[PDB]
Amino acid sequence: MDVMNRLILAMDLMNRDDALRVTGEVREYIDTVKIGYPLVLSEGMDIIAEFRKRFGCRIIADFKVADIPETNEKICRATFKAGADAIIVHGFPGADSVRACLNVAEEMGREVFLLTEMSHPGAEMFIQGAADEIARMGVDLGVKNYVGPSTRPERLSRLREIIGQDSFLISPGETLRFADAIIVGRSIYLADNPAAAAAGIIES
Amino acid sequence: VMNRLILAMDLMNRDDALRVTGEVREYIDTVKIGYPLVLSEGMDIIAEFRKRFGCRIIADFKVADIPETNEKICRATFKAGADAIIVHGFPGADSVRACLNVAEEMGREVFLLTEMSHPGAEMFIQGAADEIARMGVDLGVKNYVGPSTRPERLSRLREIIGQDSFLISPGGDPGETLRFADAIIVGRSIYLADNPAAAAAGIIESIKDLLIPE
Numbered sequence: 001m002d003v004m005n006r007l008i009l010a011m012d013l014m015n016r017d018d019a020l021r022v023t024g025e026v027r028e029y030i031d032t033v034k035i036g037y038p039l040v041l042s043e044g045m046d047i048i049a050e051f052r053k054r055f056g057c058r059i060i061a062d063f064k065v066a067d068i069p070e071t072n073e074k075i076c077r078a079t080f081k082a083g084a085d086a087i088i089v090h091g092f093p094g095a096d097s098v099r100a101c102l103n104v105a106e107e108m109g110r111e112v113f114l115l116t117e118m119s120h121p122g123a124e125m126f127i128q129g130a131a132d133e134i135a136r137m138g139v140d141l142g143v144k145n146y147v148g149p150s151t152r153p154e155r156l157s158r159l160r161e162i163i164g165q166d167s168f169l170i171s172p173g174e175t176l177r178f179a180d181a182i183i184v185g186r187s188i189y190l191a192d193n194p195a196a197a198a199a200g201i202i203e204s
Numbered sequence: 205v206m207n208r209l210i211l212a213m214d215l216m217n218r219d220d221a222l223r224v225t226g227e228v229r230e231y232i233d234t235v236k237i238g239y240p241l242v243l244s245e246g247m248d249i250i251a252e253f254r255k256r257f258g259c260r261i262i263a264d265f266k267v268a269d270i271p272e273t274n275e276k277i278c279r280a281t282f283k284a285g286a287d288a289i290i291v292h293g294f295p296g297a298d299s300v301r302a303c304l305n306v307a308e309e310m311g312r313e314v315f316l317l318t319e320m321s322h323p324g325a326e327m328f329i330q331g332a333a334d335e336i337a338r339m340g341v342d343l344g345v346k347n348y349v350g351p352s353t354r355p356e357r358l359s360r361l362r363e364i365i366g367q368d369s370f371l372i373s374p375g376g377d378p379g380e381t382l383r384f385a386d387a388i389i390v391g392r393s394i395y396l397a398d399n400p401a402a403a404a405a406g407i408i409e410s411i412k413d414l415l416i417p418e
C-alpha cells in the first residue's frame with residue numbers, strides 16, 4: 001500500500017515507444033503507473049506485462065469499469081490476468097457492480113480503487129450529487145482504495161473524513177495533506193526531460 | 205439494421221465468436237461486441253469481423269471517462285473498425301459531446317446509454333434516466349440503447365427521444381420490444397443455440413409477421 005515517493009505517473013500516451021521511454025526514464029523516482037484504455041486498446045493488453053517485466057512498475061488500470069456485474073467480472077478477470085495490480089471502477093452503476101469487481105480482486109489477490117467523483121465539466125450534472133453516497137457505499141462494501149477528483153484540497157478533506165484514516169486515497173503539496181499519493185501526467189510524460197520533471201515534483 | 209436484429213456476441217473465445225457470427229450472417233449483419241472479447245483477443249478482432257463478414261460493429265464499451273480521454277478511446281475504437289460506440293451519459297454533457305465530436309470527424313456513430321436495469325441500477329442510475337435521455341436530446345444524440353428489462357421503460361424512453369431517434373434494446377418478444385425499439389439485441393438465445401442460424405432465422409420470421417410501420 002506504499003507508492004514510491006507518493007507520486008503516480010498517469011501514462012496517458014497511446015504510443016508504446018513514448019510510453020516505455022518515459023516510464024523507463026522516471027523509474028528511479030516512480031514505481032506506480034496508471035494506464036488507460038487509449039494505450040491498451042492501441043497497443044494491446046500485453047503491454048501491461050511489458051511495463052511490469054521491463055521496469056517492475058505496479059500497474060493501475062484506469063478503466064472506469066461501469067457495466068453490469070457479470071460483465072464487470074469478466075473485464076476485471078481479463079485485466080488482472082494481463083498483470084494489472086489494481087483496476088479503477090465507477091460507483092454510479094451501484095453496489096452489485098462494484099462488488100463483482102471486488103470479488104475478482106479478492107479471488108486473484110489484486111485491488112480495486114473506487115472512483116467517488118469526477119471534476120471535469122459536466123460532472124456537476126449527475127456525479128457531483130451522488131459523490132458522498134458513492135463514497136459511503138464504498139466504505140460499506142469494504143473498499144479500501146479510492147481515487148479522488150482533480151480538485152482543491154478542501155474537498156479531499158471531506159472525502160477523507162468519509163473514508164477514514166486507514167483507507168488509501170490517490171488524486172490528481174496541499175493535496176498530499178489528504179491523499180496518500182498524487183497523480184501526475186502531462187507535466188512528466190510530455191516533458192523534454194521526464195526524469196528532471198519527476199525529480200522536481202518529488203522536491204516537496 | 206438488417207432484419208431489425210442485432211447479435212450480442214458476448215462469448216470470450218475468438219473461435220466460437222467468429223464461428224457463430226459467420227453462421228448467422230445471412231440474417232444478421234450488425235454485431236455488438238464488448239470489452240471482455242476485445243481485451244482478451246485484441247482490438248484487431250473488430251477489423252476481423254468487418255473484413256471477414258462485412259459486419260457492422262457496435263463497440264459496447266460504455267465509455268465513461270473525462271472528455272479528453274473519451275475522445276482518445278473513441279478514436280482508437282473507430283480506427284480499429286467499429287461503426288458505432290456505446291457511451292454512458294452519467295458522466296455528463298461534455299463527456300458525451302467529446303464522443304460525438306470524434307464520431308462526427310470520422311463519420312461514425314455514438315449510441316447513448318441512458319439507463320441500466322441490473323441489481324443496483326436503482327441506487328443512482330434509475331433516478332437519473334429521464335434527465336440523461338433529455339440531455340442526449342439536447343446534445344443532438346440520435347442513437348440510443350435501452351435497458352434490458354421492463355417494456356414499460358421503453359415506452360417512456362421512446363416518448364423522450366421522439367420518433368426520429370434510433371433505439372436498440374435487448375429483449376412476448378420480439379413483438380413487445382419492437383413496439384418501441386427500432387431493433388432488438390439478442391445474445392444467448394442465438395449464440396448458445398445448437399443451430400444459431402436456425403435461432404436467428406426463427407426470430408427474423410416473427411419480426412416479419414409484425415408488419416412494423418416505418
Ligand SMILES: Nc1ccn([C@@H]2O[C@H](COP(=O)(O)O)[C@@H](O)[C@H]2O)c(=O)n1
Nearest residue numbers: 010119120150172183184185186187270
Ligand atoms: N479534469 C481532469 C483532468 C485530468 N484528471 C486526472 O489526472 C490524470 C493526470 O492528469 P495530467 O496529465 O493533467 O497531470 C489523468 O490521467 C486523469 O485521471 C482528472 O481527474 N480530471
Ligand SMILES: Nc1ccn([C@@H]2O[C@H](COP(=O)(O)O)[C@@H](O)[C@H]2O)c(=O)n1
Nearest residue numbers: 068212214351352374389390391392393
Ligand atoms: N442481465 C443482463 C443481461 C444481458 N443484457 C444485455 O443484453 C445483451 C444480450 O443479452 P442476452 O444474451 O440475454 O440476449 C447483452 O450483451 C447486454 O448488453 C443486460 O443489459 N442485462
